[PDB]
Design an enzyme around this catalytic site. Structure first.
Site, PDB file in Angstrom:
ATOM      1  N   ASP A   3       2.666   2.140   7.758  1.00  0.00           N
ATOM      2  CA  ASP A   3       1.454   1.398   7.493  1.00  0.00           C
ATOM      3  C   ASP A   3       2.013   0.180   6.467  1.00  0.00           C
ATOM      4  OD1 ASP A   3      -0.348   2.578   8.875  1.00  0.00           O
ATOM      5  OD2 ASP A   3      -1.087   4.197   7.244  1.00  0.00           O
ATOM      6  N   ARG A   5       0.289   9.294   0.686  1.00  0.00           N
ATOM      7  CA  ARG A   5      -0.228   9.313   2.009  1.00  0.00           C
ATOM      8  C   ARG A   5      -0.035   8.363   2.884  1.00  0.00           C
ATOM      9  NH1 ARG A   5      -3.581   6.408  -1.830  1.00  0.00           N
ATOM     10  NH2 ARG A   5      -3.522   4.073  -1.380  1.00  0.00           N
ATOM     11  N   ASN A   6       0.750   7.394   2.487  1.00  0.00           N
ATOM     12  CA  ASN A   6       1.553   6.538   3.327  1.00  0.00           C
ATOM     13  C   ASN A   6       3.151   6.929   3.511  1.00  0.00           C
ATOM     14  OD1 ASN A   6      -0.437   5.123   4.714  1.00  0.00           O
ATOM     15  ND2 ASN A   6      -0.583   3.544   3.000  1.00  0.00           N
ATOM     16  N   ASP A  16       0.712  -1.215  -0.040  1.00  0.00           N
ATOM     17  CA  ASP A  16       0.019  -0.092  -0.129  1.00  0.00           C
ATOM     18  C   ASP A  16       0.763   1.216  -0.150  1.00  0.00           C
ATOM     19  OD1 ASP A  16      -2.371   1.523  -0.186  1.00  0.00           O
ATOM     20  OD2 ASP A  16      -2.637   1.444   2.065  1.00  0.00           O
TER      21      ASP A  16
HETATM   22  N1  LIG Z   1       1.186   8.587  12.969  1.00  0.00           N
HETATM   23  C1  LIG Z   1       0.746   9.483  12.542  1.00  0.00           C
HETATM   24  N2  LIG Z   1       0.738  10.767  12.848  1.00  0.00           N
HETATM   25  C2  LIG Z   1      -0.103  11.980  12.437  1.00  0.00           C
HETATM   26  N3  LIG Z   1      -1.104  11.569  11.331  1.00  0.00           N
HETATM   27  C3  LIG Z   1      -1.113  10.121  11.219  1.00  0.00           C
HETATM   28  C4  LIG Z   1      -0.409   9.153  11.494  1.00  0.00           C
HETATM   29  N4  LIG Z   1      -0.514   7.936  10.870  1.00  0.00           N
HETATM   30  C5  LIG Z   1      -1.370   8.363  10.052  1.00  0.00           C
HETATM   31  N5  LIG Z   1      -1.784   9.552  10.217  1.00  0.00           N
HETATM   32  C6  LIG Z   1      -2.904  10.293   9.494  1.00  0.00           C
HETATM   33  O1  LIG Z   1      -4.048   9.274   9.567  1.00  0.00           O
HETATM   34  C7  LIG Z   1      -4.853   9.689   8.718  1.00  0.00           C
HETATM   35  C8  LIG Z   1      -5.577   8.168   8.112  1.00  0.00           C
HETATM   36  O2  LIG Z   1      -4.437   7.146   7.579  1.00  0.00           O
HETATM   37  P1  LIG Z   1      -4.710   5.865   7.490  1.00  0.00           P
HETATM   38  O3  LIG Z   1      -6.100   5.125   7.902  1.00  0.00           O
HETATM   39  O4  LIG Z   1      -3.766   5.185   7.258  1.00  0.00           O
HETATM   40  O5  LIG Z   1      -5.292   6.033   5.836  1.00  0.00           O
HETATM   41  P2  LIG Z   1      -4.677   6.266   4.684  1.00  0.00           P
HETATM   42  O6  LIG Z   1      -3.315   5.727   4.560  1.00  0.00           O
HETATM   43  O7  LIG Z   1      -4.742   7.587   4.239  1.00  0.00           O
HETATM   44  N6  LIG Z   1      -5.281   5.322   3.356  1.00  0.00           N
HETATM   45  P3  LIG Z   1      -4.851   3.882   3.297  1.00  0.00           P
HETATM   46  O8  LIG Z   1      -4.047   3.460   2.235  1.00  0.00           O
HETATM   47  O9  LIG Z   1      -6.371   3.309   2.969  1.00  0.00           O
HETATM   48  O10 LIG Z   1      -4.593   3.280   4.776  1.00  0.00           O
HETATM   49  C9  LIG Z   1      -3.977  10.266   7.416  1.00  0.00           C
HETATM   50  O11 LIG Z   1      -4.537  11.536   7.238  1.00  0.00           O
HETATM   51  C10 LIG Z   1      -2.820  10.127   7.870  1.00  0.00           C
HETATM   52  O12 LIG Z   1      -1.981  10.871   7.324  1.00  0.00           O
HETATM   53 MG   LIG Z   2      -2.394   4.622   5.752  1.00  0.00          MG
END
Ligand SMILES: Nc1ncnc2c1ncn2[C@@H]1O[C@H](COP(=O)(O)OP(=O)(O)NP(=O)(O)O)[C@@H](O)[C@H]1O
Ligand SMILES: [Mg+2]
Ligand SMILES: Nc1ncnc2c1ncn2[C@@H]1O[C@H](COP(=O)(O)OP(=O)(O)NP(=O)(O)O)[C@@H](O)[C@H]1O
Ligand SMILES: [Mg+2]
Lengths: 297, 297
Positions: A153, A139-140, A135
């Site tokens: 992730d 965004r990751n 993945d």
């Molecule tokens: N450790 C973190 N600190 C601050 N923000 C975070 C952190 N981890 C994740 N996020 C934010 O949390 C939100 C949701 O992340 P996530 O649930 O992983 O969805 P995603 O990565 O955007 N999509 P996906 O590919 O489906 O996982 C996103 O805006 C990330 O930027």
């Molecule tokens: Mg994510």
């Protein structure tokens, strides 16, 4: 296995949602160490729901906890009592995709190239560890500081059981995931950075993607990019997986480019967008990053 | 001294959000730093000097600030930034745990021998560094040791006394009498600091007016042996308080003696329930470091 902290429910509280994804919901949280008066900010991801026992989830988590690279986020803690809740370092800057959109057209060549190098380095380490992300996307990648980014992730996808626009042809057609498929995702990720956060294949339905790829259609060359940069992206997007660049090759190439950033990326006002002065860098590290390629002048 | 080490901040860069306390030199706030052009708010500690300053006076303040900014040791806090507002402000790393004196008081009968001895070693290491650098603290006290994590403490407020009632009860006799300050006078203060920890936060010479301290000291009166302290521990403390400065232990010697004791802590401090008390554990330590303490230590 001192690497993974098992947290009691009393120990922490979800405070607010930061976002959600295919695999779960992420919250800003506080950890309250038992017997102490402090409240420490953390990130909690509460996993979306079948197949796996608590012991199996734990085993996978240990692996996630064991990664040790500056460009990969390590799982810190877990709570298994109800939902599976994963605890990780909270990143105030958020993800790289959000950062690039926020700073659209006002990010230097030096930053963009260095991020590409860093993303490659973290991916290469994951490859060393025989971990396939499945993945990867902008965004990751998480922004620790604007100068330091980290992959996040990884392997959630394996643990829980869909990003078609980032997927390699083989992944879409046959559901096969490999380091080489991750390379395809890296190419897309790079495209996102270079376009300042554009949505890939915008206006094209997910179903169409395989058909278009088969026709030999690919994401367009970003205006800032010289051909050399675009060529790297196209290579990540070759149909034959073996033909694609290795992450280690990618580290080398981007690093080289990073040495003469203005030659490979054309950005208006680039001269004014240089990496932080030592004074600024020292300050950032002290406050946020106690844990970079530069122009050869 | 490397100028890149000290960052000069615009007033618009940061905000005060809570009062942490006050001292002879100034008032300390929890603050937020908003990096120019960024969304994020980063927690910091700000110390604002009590006096308003002339621009001429400040230049002296600045030269001192550069030195303060130069200290590079895991057991000493380093000045990070300054703002020469009408009234001068120092920016450093925020320590949520607060000062060690407050911490020992808060955990008063619940602290293990291993922790106390370890803190003694750490404070000694930090002072030794300062001594190596030909720097004299002049205001060492338990109040002036900050808790980064329970396993990790750092000396603070180095160099403030020089820029600037005096802390009589921590002062060596020569400092009270003649305002003579040296590394050996710093040793005297260290002994008092050890006494504060060993007594879990007791006020030194409580019920004796500060105006009469020199008089008792000349008489040979000293702080009493703490209930948990064995003779070997008390003797080191007493040694710190010899009239002849050259009779006092060296910081290097102190690190060794305390390190040895730390190796067999229950031999040197006798504490009720010591068998029960939490002792820092690798899983706990890793978690704390990842969340709060990534510094080389
Ligand atoms: N450790 C973190 N600190 C601050 N923000 C975070 C952190 N981890 C994740 N996020 C934010 O949390 C939100 C949701 O992340 P996530 O649930 O992983 O969805 P995603 O990565 O955007 N999509 P996906 O590919 O489906 O996982 C996103 O805006 C990330 O930027
Ligand atoms: Mg994510
Ligand atoms: N960096 C910090 N993070 C959190 N608290 C701090 C920090 N620095 C200082 N403090 C606290 O701020 C308060 C004020 O300290 P300060 O003004 O230095 O006076 P003091 O240390 O109590 N006495 P003294 O330093 O001798 O004047 C104290 O409670 C400190 O513990
Ligand atoms: Mg102080």
């Amino acid at each position: 296995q001192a690497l993974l902290r098992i947290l009691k429910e009393t120990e922490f509280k979800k405070i607010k949602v930061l976002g959600s994804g295919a695999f779960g919901t992420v919250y800003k949280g506080l950890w309250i160490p038992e017997g102490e008066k402090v409240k420490i900010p953390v990130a909690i991801k509460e996993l979306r729901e079948s197949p796996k026992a608590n012991k199996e989830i734990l085993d996978e988590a240990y692996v996630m906890a064991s990664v040790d690279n500056p460009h990969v986020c390590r799982l810190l803690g877990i709570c298994l009592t109800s939902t599976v809740q994963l605890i990780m370092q909270l990143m105030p800057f958020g993800c790289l995709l959000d950062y690039v959109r926020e700073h659209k057209d006002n990010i230097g060549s030096q930053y963009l190239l260095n991020w590409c190098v860093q993303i490659a380095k973290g991916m290469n380490y994951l490859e060393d560890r025989r971990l396939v992300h499945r993945d990867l996307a902008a965004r990751n990648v998480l922004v620790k500081t604007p100068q330091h980014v980290k992959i996040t992730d990884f392997g959630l996808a394996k643990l829980l059981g869909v990003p078609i626009k980032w997927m390699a042809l083989e992944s879409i057609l046959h559901r096969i995931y490999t380091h080489q498929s991750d390379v395809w995702s890296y190419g897309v990720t790079v495209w996102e950075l270079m376009t300042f956060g554009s949505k890939p294949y915008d206006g094209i339905p997910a179903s169409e993607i395989s058909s278009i790829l088969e026709k030999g259609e690919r994401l367009p060359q970003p205006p800032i990019c010289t051909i050399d940069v675009y060529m790297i992206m196209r290579k990540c997007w070759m149909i034959d997986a073996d033909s694609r660049p290795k992450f280690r090759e990618l580290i080398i190439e981007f690093s080289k480019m990073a040495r003469d950033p203005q030659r490979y990326l054309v950005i208006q006002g680039d001269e004014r967008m240089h990496l932080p002065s030592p004074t600024d860098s020292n300050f950032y590290r002290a406050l946020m990053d106690e844990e970079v390629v530069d122009a050869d002048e």
